[PDB]
Every structure is written in structure tokens, then in C-alpha cells.
Ligand binder design. Structure first.
Ligand code: PHE
Ligand code: BA
Ligand code: BA
Ligand code: BA
Ligand code: BA
Length: 362
């Protein structure tokens, strides 16, 4: 179709801007999921990007962790409004933190990401990350305002572990991946995924990478303007805040089932996508968030989903609630600065795709 050529062109043009490669899973109303790729999964071996290449989806992990927690609220063992002192009695301010505050980025919890070395071989535990956050981060008052929190989801992950007697991956696998037949999806803290299948991730030496968000000391020298950042950071360091590996195809399966009421009951789905307040994420299109989903605005269209940034893999997932269109776009190019083209520019082909869908629909 014409939409097919228009979408493929949008991807080609984005790769031609300097992006190494891009993989898209798009699902439209009345149609099967269609996959598109452009550019490379491996820059130096010139291996074409396929719809089978795996990516680190970074904080899109957070939508699955929120889902995991909402499922436990349904099981009846967790209450969104109960104080987390039940699980973390000695966590400062825990009494002023209901369970939901872990999911909505208004907890005021000290964060770890800006302090955590991206280049290491260090294995992390959940508690260790929490300790590291209170050591190096700044705590604000619960409900102070919106400030993106990774710590919140590490704590959510620990509630899941406590309430299920097992790693959070087992709960996510048994309750989300298996039922949906998501065969190309792993939780990197607790599970081994096959690296040979993973698209390589590239960090760009770029002029607009002025204020890097990560400690990337020890990168060594760039080859051909890039670093192969794929195995820089051990996923245990992101834990429940961003440790998942998946394909666009697998992600779009999840989005469809979530929004089609096939995972969470109506009330918990509503908590996730509809019980919203204003939200900000630097460089992004984010305008609001619920309890596990960001609302991201693209002109006259909006995605309910998430963004992901982990060295070299830059992802956008979401459902457009108006048209029923679901998507996951992941490029294997990135940088450190939130406002760098290689990070914030991922929003450009997403914007263009949504206006191409909209144009074929008029
Ligand atoms: N902050 C990243 C996820 C992440 C958390 C912690 C460490 C590394 C990566 C994101 O929003 O996608
Ligand atoms: Ba600087
Ligand atoms: Ba390493
Ligand atoms: Ba509109
Ligand atoms: Ba038209």
C-alpha cells in the first residue's frame, strides 16, 4: 500500500540522518501487525536490521512492572493506597508513600541513574540500588510535584518479589509473557537472554551531546564516530526501572492485550492509563503520566505508552487511543544528552508515522 511505502520512507530518511538502524512494529485497526526496518543491527558487519533483532527496551520495562503490580492488586494482596512501610519500614518518608506513589513519579524518592556507572561488570541487587539512591540522590517530599523516578519502580519490583515469593521476572513471565505467547522477551536482571540475537547499540560522538545524563567514563576511543555500547551496562543496574529485552513485535503484542482489556481488569487499566496528572521527561514529548504509562503528544496524536533510553537503544512504544493504532519504534543509535538528536530525535519518525496513518485515514 501507499501507507507502507510512506512508513518505509520515513524510516529510510531517519537512518539517512545518521541513525544506524530502526525497527518498527505497527498495529492498525482491522489489520495484522506489520513490521518495518531500515539500516543496520551491526554497523561494522553491515548486517541488516530484521524484526527478529532484540533490543534493550529500557524504561518501557516500567509499563510491565506497573502491570505486574496492578495484577497483585487484583489478586487482593496489595492496595494501591496503602503505605509502603509494610515492605520498607525504615525507608525514609515511607509512611507518606502509598503504593501508587511508586508508579506515578511523584514520590520524591532519591534517584540512582545519574550516579550509576554505565560502564562496569558489577552485578546489582534491588536493595543495593535503593541504598545507592539514598546515598547519592536527593530526596524530596512525597507529592512535591512530578519528577521522573527510577527508584520508585525498583521498590515496586521488590513488592512484587515479596508478595509472590519469587523474582519479579517469574511473575511477569507467568502472568504476561507466557499467556500472550511473547517468546522473544526477557527480564535481564533475573534471566539470560541470547546476546547473539541482540541488535548492537551505538552511542554517537555528537556535538549536541553537551550535557551527558550518564557516567560513561571508560568508554575508550570512538570507532567511526561511535561506541558499541551494547554490553556497557549490566541490566541488573536498571533492575525494575529498565532491564527488559524484547522485539518491537513482542512489545506490540503486549500493548494490544493491555488496551484490549486482556491483562488488567477495567479498574486497574484505568489506574494505569487514565488516572493521570501532568508529567515531564527532558527532551521528550511527555505531557502526563498514569500509574505505569506516559502520555506523549505528537501534534494531533497522542501515544499512551513509554519512552526508553539505555546506551545505544532508544525506544518509543504506545497506543494511540483515538485511532486504536499501537506501535513500538526502536533505533540502535543514542547519545547521553536528553536533547541530543540521537536521543530526542527518535520522536521525529514516530511523529511522522502517526501523521501518515492519520493521512491515509481521511
Ligand atoms: N532511565 C532509563 C532507564 C534506566 C534506568 C536506570 C539505569 C539505566 C537505564 C529510561 O528512562 O529509559
Ligand atoms: Ba559537559
Ligand atoms: Ba560490561
Ligand atoms: Ba486529536
Ligand atoms: Ba487524505
Amino acid at each position: 500500500s501507499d501507507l507502507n511505502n510512506a512508513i518505509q520512507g520515513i524510516l529510510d530518511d531517519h537512518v539517512a540522518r545518521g541513525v544506524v538502524g530502526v525497527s518498527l512494529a505497527l498495529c492498525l485497526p482491522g489489520e495484522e501487525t506489520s513490521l518495518y526496518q531500515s539500516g543496520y543491527a551491526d554497523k561494522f558487519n553491515k548486517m541488516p536490521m530484521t524484526g527478529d533483532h532484540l533490543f534493550r527496551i529500557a524504561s518501557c520495562t516500567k509499563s510491565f512492572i506497573a502491570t505486574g503490580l496492578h495484577l497483585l492488586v487484583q489478586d487482593g494482596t496489595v492496595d494501591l493506597d496503602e503505605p509502603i512501610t509494610r515492605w520498607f519500614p525504615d525507608l525514609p518518608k515511607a509512611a507518606q508513600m502509598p503504593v501508587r506513589i511508586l508508579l506515578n513519579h511523584r514520590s520524591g524518592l532519591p534517584d540512582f541513574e545519574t550516579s550509576m556507572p554505565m560502564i562496569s561488570d558489577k552485578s546489582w541487587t534491588a536493595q543495593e540500588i535503593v541504598d545507592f539512591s539514598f546515598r547519592h540522590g536527593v530526596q524530596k517530599e512525597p507529592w512535591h510535584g512530578m519528577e521522573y523516578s527510577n527508584t520508585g519502580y525498583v521498590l515496586a519490583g521488590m513488592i512484587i518479589a515479596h508478595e509472590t515469593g519469587k523474582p519479579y521476572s517469574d511473575h511477569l513471565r507467568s502472568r504476561i509473557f507466557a499467556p500472550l505467547g511473547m517468546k522473544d522477551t526477557w527480564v535481564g536482571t533475573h534471566e539470560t537472554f541470547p546476546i547473539e540475537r541482540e541488535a548492537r547499540g551505538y552511542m554517537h560522538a555528537a556535538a549536541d551531546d553537551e550535557n551527558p545524563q550518564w557516567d560513561v567514563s571508560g568508554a575508550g576511543d570512538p570507532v567511526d564516530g561511535v561506541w558499541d555500547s551494547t554490553e556497557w551496562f549490566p541490566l541488573s543496574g536498571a533492575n525494575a526501572a529498565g532491564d527488559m529485552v524484547s522485539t518491537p513485535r513482542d512489545i506490540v503484542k503486549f500493548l494490544n492485550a493491555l488496551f484490549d482489556g486482556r491483562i488488567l481488569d477495567q479498574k486497574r487499566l484505568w489506574e494505569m492509563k487514565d488516572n493521570i496528572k501532568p508529567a515531564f521527561f527532558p527532551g521528550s514529548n511527555t505531557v502526563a503520566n498514569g500509574h505505569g504509562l506516559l502520555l506523549m503528544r505528537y501534534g494531533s496524536s497522542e501515544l499512551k505508552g513509554h519512552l526508553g533510553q539505555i546506551p545505544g537503544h532508544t525506544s518509543i512504544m504506545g497506543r494511540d487511543e483515538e485511532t486504536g493504532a499501537a506501535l513500538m519504534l526502536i533505533q540502535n543509535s543514542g547519545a547521553g544528552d536528553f536533547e541530543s538528536f540521537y536521543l530526542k530525535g527518535v520522536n521525529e519518525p514516530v511523529d511522522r508515522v502517526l501523521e501518515a496513518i492519520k493521512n491515509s485515514r481521511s
